Design a protein around this ligand. Sequence first.
Ligand code: LXL
Ligand code: GTP
Ligand code: ACP
Ligand code: GDP
Ligand code: CA
Ligand code: MG
Ligand code: MG
Lengths: 54, 437, 426, 334
Amino acid sequence: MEVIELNKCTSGQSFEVILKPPSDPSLEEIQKKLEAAEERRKYQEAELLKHLAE
Amino acid sequence: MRECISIHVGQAGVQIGNACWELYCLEHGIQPDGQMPSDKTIGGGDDSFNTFFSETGAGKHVPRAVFVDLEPTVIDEVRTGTYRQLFHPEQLITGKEDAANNYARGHYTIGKEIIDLVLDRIRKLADQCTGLQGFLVFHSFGGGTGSGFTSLLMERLSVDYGKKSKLEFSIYPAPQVSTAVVEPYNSILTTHTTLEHSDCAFMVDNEAIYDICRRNLDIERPTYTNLNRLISQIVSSITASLRFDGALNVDLTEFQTNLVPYPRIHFPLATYAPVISAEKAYHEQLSVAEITNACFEPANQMVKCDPRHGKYMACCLLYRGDVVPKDVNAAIATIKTKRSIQFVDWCPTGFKVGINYQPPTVVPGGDLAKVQRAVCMLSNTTAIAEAWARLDHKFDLMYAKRAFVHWYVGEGMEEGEFSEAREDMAALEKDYEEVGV
Amino acid sequence: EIVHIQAGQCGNQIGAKFWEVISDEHGIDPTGSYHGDSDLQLERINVYYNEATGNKYVPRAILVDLEPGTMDSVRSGPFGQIFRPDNFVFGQSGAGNNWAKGHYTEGAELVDSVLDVVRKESESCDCLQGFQLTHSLGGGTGSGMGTLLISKIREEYPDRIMNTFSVMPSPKVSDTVVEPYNATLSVHQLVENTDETYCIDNEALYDICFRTLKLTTPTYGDLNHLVSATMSGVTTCLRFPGQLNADLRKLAVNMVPFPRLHFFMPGFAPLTSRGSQQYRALTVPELTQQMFDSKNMMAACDPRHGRYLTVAAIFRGRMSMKEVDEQMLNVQNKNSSYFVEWIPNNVKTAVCDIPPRGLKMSATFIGNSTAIQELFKRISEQFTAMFRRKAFLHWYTGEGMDEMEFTEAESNMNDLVSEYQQYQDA
Amino acid sequence: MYTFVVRDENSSVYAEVSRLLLATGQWKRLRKDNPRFNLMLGERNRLPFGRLGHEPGLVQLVNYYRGADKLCRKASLVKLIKTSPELSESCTWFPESYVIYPTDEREVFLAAYNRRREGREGNVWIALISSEASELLDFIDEQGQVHVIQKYLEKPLLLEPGHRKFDIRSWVLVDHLYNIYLYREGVLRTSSEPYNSANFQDKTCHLTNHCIQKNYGRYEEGNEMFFEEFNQYLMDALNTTLENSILLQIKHIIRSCLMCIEPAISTKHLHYQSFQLFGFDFMVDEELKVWLIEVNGAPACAQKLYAELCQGIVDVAISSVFPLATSIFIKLHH
Ligand SMILES: CCC[C@H](Nc1nc(-c2ccc(NC(=O)NCC)c(OC)c2)ncc1C)c1cccnc1
Ligand SMILES: Nc1nc2c(ncn2[C@@H]2O[C@H](COP(=O)(O)OP(=O)(O)OP(=O)(O)O)[C@@H](O)[C@H]2O)c(=O)[nH]1
Ligand SMILES: Nc1ncnc2c1ncn2[C@@H]1O[C@H](COP(=O)(O)OP(=O)(O)CP(=O)(O)O)[C@@H](O)[C@H]1O
Ligand SMILES: Nc1nc2c(ncn2[C@@H]2O[C@H](COP(=O)(O)OP(=O)(O)O)[C@@H](O)[C@H]2O)c(=O)[nH]1
Ligand SMILES: [Ca+2]
Ligand SMILES: [Mg+2]
Ligand SMILES: [Mg+2]
């Protein structure tokens, strides 16, 4: 029904039609998560080479 | 004018990115060698198209884009592509071995050894910006790179560029074209880690695009080339306001304001029409009423769901071609009395309309026919939660047996992150429920 | 790149046969020179071949044995000249079908020499992805030394993929009575140090040659025709470009939900005998029906006695990918009970335009079924029958082994059996 | 060979359907959580509609219409009829009703209660049945859940011999094409005890539920009069037929209700399909004017009619979608 905020230009035009009214982590933490995962990888790899050593 | 940087991650992001930039060049009249005959301001300027392009003294118009993949296969086809001259080496980043469809491998393992390089190449573009508003990130949910590395990148960008907005164009996984089995894991994981860092994300279910290519283009077996061309058209409709003169969605912040009242619920449903085959000889051109009515057919949505059994929080209509406000309001009035369009009580039942007189451009030799008028509806409906429900169910079936979990644990990730991610998704489904019913 | 290894009599004979088949597909002659018509044959030839000075491609293969007998037959074989001469690493004593000799004494004396060739090949790779081994588990060298190599390759390359094409022993096709011992000791190693093990059962190969191919008395040659055809089949996606952006690691990830359960059932269709050209091409429904049939399984196990964890299917030749998609979706929907429901969409399919030599179109099957336990149970019963009386055990204790290590191998394999049974009722 | 799943064990209707399907030798039953099905006989609560129609190479069908609950809930039905212009506040065949919440349109209800009292006419209502508004509002607040207040038809048509009250149950089947099929065999769930006009406390002759009644089995077997008998009674006693005097109004009400919600539940262009069996409860007054009481989304059939109806569902709703290698329904055309 009600058309509002009609704006026109050479490229086109835009508007709004209303039918009815209503009724973060830091760089420190990130580098810590990534390195904590790297240690867990290094531990698993160490256990393998330890197992293979046996 | 304020610049926008596009980021393409993984196979899906890169190939889709190529389709988009190919389409952008055709729309703005930019040639493969970067030259733009219509641009009379040689060496620079601050027109609307400069949001996505920067200019050299030689008059070349280069995309403000960065391609990144942990494997050189796909990006190499960009280096040797028809638009090879368009970009320059520093924009194209490639690794040695991929993430093997593993989120943890793309996030923690391989993600850590290249994240600094990418941010550096991104920072190079950011320095060429007088006023950067944010980023457009293209990636898949299924891929290890698209899921894993993107979430890591989104985290750092929120740190390195706090005041900047960040939009997503995500490919929701579909078994019909996917070749991996652990994509539900990667999807839940990347969504969980990315949620707080993304302001607005447009999901595109390959299932929907796949069937649209079968149903409306009569392609028996759609390839990624078929899907990406059609996807790029939708993306173009969404980003047209950033690349052309207008007053609706002229900056990234306005996407949040117009489509996203609640931060966490930032997944607008896209619906596009008309999709006509190019090899279709006789085609009766569709009117404003017909294409606008097609925006409420589930068979035209980027994600298959039922908006009737949900609630709207916002709705934008983006037309391209021969369209005028009078015909739109007449079409809206008819559709309103014939369809179930329930808005939330704390939102006005209305439509923010945007029109661009230039009809939608199609790539020569493509599958799409040139139409007199097209439309893309961006509606934030709770009905899109059905996609989360489908995905979380697949996740639960696999995680109940801890299947494939050892692959993620073996990359340094803790098994607790699976459940913590699943819990966040459980909270998300609840948020949709509260608003929806 | 992939580094190929072949150990023992069986390993070298299927290995040589494998290189013979794919060399023809890639257009490579015994001389080593390329002579084809399609660039598709060379787009991914680097995976298995090193490019030498001139226009000649050399297999990235390493031929191992404790006896010069078989390796001399290879070098004098059809494509005997193609192999790099330095990659011929052989002892003189032999292994006498003794796992102990191959793994601890005779083979340990030679294993270091082999690794030197592996390292020299690896250092030539731009980006080594993994390894593959061809061998039997019933003998001594391929079984004993083969698993020794795997263990040491993992120590030096702990982040690379390790695949194996393991030939399983069978009383129907048997050289010695101690084959169940060698196999049981070998499986113990394969469960730990391999990402993929393609279980190739001589019982199945024999029955296929006899019941289906109607060969009254099959030789090892008839058996190897099936192995080479299957191996060319599974490696198709790696050796030719297609829609599937193939990658060694990705297959291992998507096929193996649990690390120990990585023993696959190979399959092939249509089944063909040596030289016998059959002129009727199979329809897509026929390819799909046969490749899933138990008669076409290279592992003597009834898939109906178990459930599929994951399945990989690769069709070759010019055909409607739509028709393939329909027939594959048909099999699943018709027999959805034989697929676990806790892995959604666990059947993936691909299509290569290039067919194998002699056939207009074919289909290769790789199934991770819980029915594979029947194979391990079979070896276990043969093992126990002798071990309860400690029979033929002096051949091993003489090489320094103890009865405990046999009890451990028996136990670990029984754990693998019960582990496969755990998911058959899930 | 089609496949289906059962997720509602308490369904007497679809227990027969599953039995019938398996007996054709062309339908196989899968496990509950097996997603590779063609037909889903789903649960009554929390039916996952969002997971339907996403299985490639499988035409999927469910025995429930999503959103049809708006018709099959007493609180929802009143809102549906009142707000829908197709039915309107001035609906002739639906009793005057209002939505009441425990401590809304309570003030609106009292407005009508005054006209009934200050007009000296029938002012009896139902949730318990009472003529005093105070006795009702206190009862709703003491229960806990939401309740609907509705006008009580003080002048019902009474069967003779016996002077008995009754209600009519019609079974309606809406297939995937939204063809509204009315099962020709309905049933009168009668009262065995004579209708007492004065005492509303005795709810044994006011409420005609098959459970409450079970003078049970005096006039007819199981307090269930089928159409052939009731039709004969109308011809002998009132000189008319069931078709004209009542069934025309029934077919009108059924068709009107489903035409209203059609655009809200239709699966015409959806990725999955839906059908559903409804149970319409009617009430006839002494002037042979039909009133709608409610609608049931998960109705139970009559023992005599299970064999015929359940077979019917297979024919038009299931086999129509999944074919195999005179009609009992009346098609209400629209
Ligand atoms: C459940 C199987 C999923 C599997 N997916 C992949 N498979 C592969 C792949 C890689 C190598 C091979 N070939 C091999 O021989 N691999 C072991 C040496 C392959 O054959 C099955 C598939 N690469 C990437 C993906 C994603 C797949 C997909 C399609 C067809 N076959 C396998
Ligand atoms: N629409 C569309 N989807 C794609 C395309 N490429 C890949 N996908 C989807 O992406 C999912 C897998 O992610 P990929 O992008 O292929 O993998 P990745 O991002 O490179 O990460 P890696 O696992 O390391 O290779 C699959 O489910 C595909 O369906 C594409 O070009 N278009
Ligand atoms: N407005 C009214 N006037 C007179 N009698 C009424 C009435 N509303 C209901 N009744 C009688 O009271 C009973 C109320 O039953 P109602 O249909 O409300 O409960 P119900 O939901 O258990 C039916 P079903 O068990 O088949 O779903 C009806 O059987 C009818 O016999
Ligand atoms: N298919 C096939 N199997 C073989 C061949 N040679 C040996 N085998 C199998 O391998 C086992 C004997 O092992 P062998 O090859 O002698 O091991 P080696 O000591 O390492 O040479 C037996 O169980 C055979 O079934 C062959 O040429 N083809
Ligand atoms: Ca300019
Ligand atoms: Mg990739
Ligand atoms: Mg031998």
